[PDB]
Amino acid sequence: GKQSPDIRADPLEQGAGDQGLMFGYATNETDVLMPAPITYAHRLVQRQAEVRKNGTLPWLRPDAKSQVTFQYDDGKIVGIDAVVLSTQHSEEIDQKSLQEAVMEEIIKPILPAEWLTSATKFFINPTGRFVIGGPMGDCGLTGRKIIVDTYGGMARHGGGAFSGKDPSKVDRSAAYAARYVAKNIVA
Amino acid sequence: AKHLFTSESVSEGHPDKIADQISDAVLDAILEQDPKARVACETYVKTGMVLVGGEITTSAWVDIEEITRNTVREIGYVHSDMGFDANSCAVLSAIGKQSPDIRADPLEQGAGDQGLMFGYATNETDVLMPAPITYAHRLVQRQAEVRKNGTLPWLRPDAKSQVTFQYDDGKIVGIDAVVLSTQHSEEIDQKSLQEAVMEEIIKPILPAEWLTSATKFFINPTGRFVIGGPMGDCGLTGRKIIVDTYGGMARHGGGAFSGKDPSKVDRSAAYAARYVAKNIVAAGLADRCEIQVSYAIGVAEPTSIMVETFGTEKVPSEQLTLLVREFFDLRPYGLIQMLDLLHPIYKETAAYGHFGREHFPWEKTDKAQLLRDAAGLK
Amino acid sequence: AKHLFTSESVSEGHPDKIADQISDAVLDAILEQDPKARVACETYVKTGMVLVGGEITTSAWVDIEEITRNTVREIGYVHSDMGFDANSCAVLSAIGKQSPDIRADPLEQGAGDQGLMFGYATNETDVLMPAPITYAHRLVQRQAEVRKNGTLPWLRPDAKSQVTFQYDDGKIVGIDAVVLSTQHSEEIDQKSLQEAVMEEIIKPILPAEWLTSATKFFINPTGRFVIGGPMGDCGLTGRKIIVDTYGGMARHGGGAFSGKDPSKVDRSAAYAARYVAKNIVAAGLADRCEIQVSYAIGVAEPTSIMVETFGTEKVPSEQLTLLVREFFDLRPYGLIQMLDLLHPIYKETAAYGHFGREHFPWEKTDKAQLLRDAAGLK
Known about the structure:
The structure is cut from a larger assembly and holds three copies of chain A.
Chain A: H1 36-54, E1 60-73, E2 76-89, H2 95-110, E3 121-124, H3 146-150, H4 170-186
Parallel strand pairs in A: 2-3
Antiparallel strand pairs in A: 1-2
């Protein structure tokens, strides 16, 4: 539903267009001042898209999910306890060869080798074949993945979705601003 | 160590809560006929249409349009002057129904999908919930109660609340700001609305000792609120997850609840995590407890279980994790068995929070005594 | 040789006519900016939603939702009590817009699609149209006129009419049955509605000498008609083609008009066929004339031209077919050039028939004198 913009007070005195809660988080755990588990979770799926697009593994398909379980000890990471990488592929590739390729080409280049011990458990497509996915597999709505966007489970969240909102709405800009002040305080 | 904490809640007339109630109304209708059904319902609510979609694996027959119109009609949208009419709105169904199939151990079923679930419980309140979210729910719940019983006939379903509590050394000492945006009819003037809302909603709910002269009240700060509901803003299922569980007081896994059958760990495990978190606090093991359970799709046992007591535990932390694994069966089917979730009781849980109301299966503290004896606290 | 003939018409509030007006309102908006655009708009109207779809090849920017709401609002659907609200209805757009491309003879362009087009004209009426369809349109048009100007404020947009004429040796001698179903408000009682409709609609329109005692009037035969319009029944573009052109008096090719730009022969050739049929009758060549033009997609010249005079021709039939080819350029672009169809004038043509109203380019009898001289009838 498109409308028409209208047409003298102080611009900085504009009130918030809607109420809400915004949370910003920052920790010196990582270089980019972010929780470690969420960063490496993003690396795996980002690596999957990178490998699929450049042609290293042509049989990959866009849909993919990752899940990394980190083992802390006195507040410091000492290893990785479980890695889950569910990816959509084509019917051409067999299941056994998919696990070998995904492990060697996605998990190995990303995660540090010292964390992956023999006690680490890998779950690469635990169910089986994953050929038809994407929108057909499940419905998709805007703002249903807010936690994986911001920090994962490491930090509290206000509950306001980001995507599809212009900066004038505090549900998005204030969350960016809260992260901005949180990062500067830690930095 | 004074610090202000804020939590908010929305009424059942909010567009994001209409979708949640419609999704769970469909779920409850299916569970009445086929308790073992698989339901994943997503609802999109626009200015004049309701789009109900998802994938259903059941042998039950339900009339989506009849359920949707009845749900909206019960909320109180009866004519277009309110901005949405239940009797004259488009109800499109995109539901894809399938047929259930037909010997191993039922408790060994793997999780249908991966995800993170967080459970939280604190001895701050009687119901073992964060205080700010409970009173935020009270205001919007009081608004619906007053509107329906006829005390204030000029109220309309859509309403939002936001309460800012002033902590001091971890204890609440007052309320710093109260915001109550409500939808009304054009009959009532703005000045009389603020007097009535303050006297009839805020006063009966919030304790009088917290409301001092320094408390700031924002009752419809913008102005008139006549046309609201779906016309004012779009509504989607699962956009209000934080106001459902705990507000901002606790971390959240990111999985929506409404429209999902108990067989999906995105909902049952969150209830189960709250169940074990409430029992640990109720047993006196910790003042605050936070539980994280993680599942991998196709795997029965959780990939990780984390208990956090924020340094308020009466027993060593590594002992608590053993107790959680010993007593509570956290396998995906074990959650259903230990909570009896296969009943049509999810219509009521999609209105003013899934937690804190004692008439729910996951809000029972029955294993609290067993845990206390196991920990040897006498 | 007495025989009863019946024709019917529907008001602009009918669901099948709302879709036609919405489709042509979109067409007129596009033609104002890009006259050479290609528009094929299909509209589906349901209880609370309007779905506008089609393929557009233009460089123009239009707001479909604003156009649709304004069109429905002008009809008179303003609140949900009528069964449909223009301000609170879902307007979904499925329009697929493309970009126009950028040297042969323009008149040699082939037809964009194949089809059959029929044109008809008879000297029975002044406007050279069948009598039953003209008076059927008068009743519904009078109903809208009375409702809007405030003579009968309790009327509502939806209305249908049906008049049964009694012929005798090819001449009308009376009216045997009049049916006028109209939508009203719950305020008016049924008995008073029939007296008002009969006195204020049927009496001023139909000639008094035709309405004898044997004439049967059916004014809302069922009963109350309060909720109608889109809620009562679905509406689609092109479902009322017969009531648009001639009723049952003439054959029809089956191509819908509303929502199609003039470049498509499914609309322009039907206008052109009526144009040549009206001129032949206006020239005195025949009392009744029927023209069929058939195009093959990708071919300029029509595959077949048929003239039928029903044995009422003043010149040999094979001579008429030569005259039609000589004077009228029936190539797909020749129709536009000889009728000046590239103007936003199609909003008015989608309400009470595309034919019989003299303010239309295809209703002009300018080549009648030329045809009469060519046939050598002095």
